Design a binder for this molecule. Structure first.
Ligand SMILES: Nc1cccc(N)n1
Length: 293
């Protein structure tokens, strides 16, 4: 009966956890995204706390509804995601000033959430939403800690591994905020080159793609790595490649920042806060993207 509180409800897409609708709230007239979560009291108390985690680069969580043993999340609506925008920008690429603006904004959103001890864990272009004003916002922040990250979605879609940090792949139990910096570095690279950086199609393909670009990690670059649950001494030993070959034609400011975002050791990996101070952002601006809505 909860859908009678919306004037119209149309399917947008298929999310990690359930159907996503665009909907119009009957009393207020506001247009929202409405996410059904398919199936639990621990998740309700965790999700409800995210209503306070408000920032201009975080998609606003308006309400959490638990009814008829189903959970709905009501979010701020934005018209386009970064996946669609990079597909649409494929012929020319996203201009560097707009890549820079987007990365800057995303780091501000991470810095905010990380300062409140909230992780995303599953960043990907799909969950980065853009508007006509040159803003970009992180969607679904805090949901992975509540519900987990499944292998398959509710519609059997494969949840992407492409943005997953190596410590997760190697079986580390304790996530840190560094996992989100890793994901964002992979997204940065993809905006620049117009081709996913590590498009793995299994846990080992993901891991070995990372290794064949950044080198097989060892105890010199990552103290403790050889004691990780899923580390195997039989991993092939690939050498490290130069970022100049990996993300041309990025500059030495961008290549330096990307390298810090893709450090193997999560304790070495740059923080969102420190990344905001990087010389790459000295000339940052906020351009207008051309959006066809
Ligand atoms: N359009 C849309 C898609 C996902 C999340 C949100 N907030 N809005």
């Amino acid at each position: 009966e909860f859908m009678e509180n919306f004037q119209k409800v149309e399917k947008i897409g298929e999310g990690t956890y359930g159907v996503v609708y665009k909907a119009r709230n009957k009393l207020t007239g506001e247009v929202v995204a409405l996410k059904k979560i398919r199936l639990p009291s621990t998740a309700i108390r965790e999700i409800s706390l995210l209503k306070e985690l408000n920032h201009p680069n975080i998609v606003k969580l308006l309400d959490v509804i638990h009814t008829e043993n189903k959970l709905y999340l009501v979010f701020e609506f934005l018209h386009q995601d970064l996946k669609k925008f990079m597909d649409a920008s494929a012929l020319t690429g996203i201009p560097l000033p707009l890549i820079k603006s987007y990365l800057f904004q995303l780091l501000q959103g991470l810095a905010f959430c990380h300062s409140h001890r909230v992780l995303h864990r599953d960043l990907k272009p799909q969950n980065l939403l853009i508007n006509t004003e040159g803003a970009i916002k992180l969607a679904d922040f805090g949901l992975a800690r509540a519900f987990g990250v499944p292998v398959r979605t509710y519609t059997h879609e494969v949840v992407t591994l492409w943005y997953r940090a190596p410590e997760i792949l190697l079986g580390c139990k304790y996530y840190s905020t560094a996992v989100d910096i890793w994901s964002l570095g992979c997204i940065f690279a993809e905006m620049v080159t117009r081709r996913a950086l590590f498009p793995g199609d299994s846990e080992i393909d993901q891991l070995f793609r990372i290794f064949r670009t950044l080198g097989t990690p060892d105890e010199v670059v990552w103290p403790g790595v050889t004691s990780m649950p899923d580390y195997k001494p039989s991993f092939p030993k690939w050498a490290r490649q130069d970022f100049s070959k990996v993300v041309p034609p990025l500059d030495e400011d961008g290549r330096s920042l990307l390298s810090q975002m893709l450090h193997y050791d999560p304790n070495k990996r740059i923080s969102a806060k420190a990344a905001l101070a990087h010389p790459f952002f000295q000339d940052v601006t906020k351009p207008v993207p051309h959006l066809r809505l």
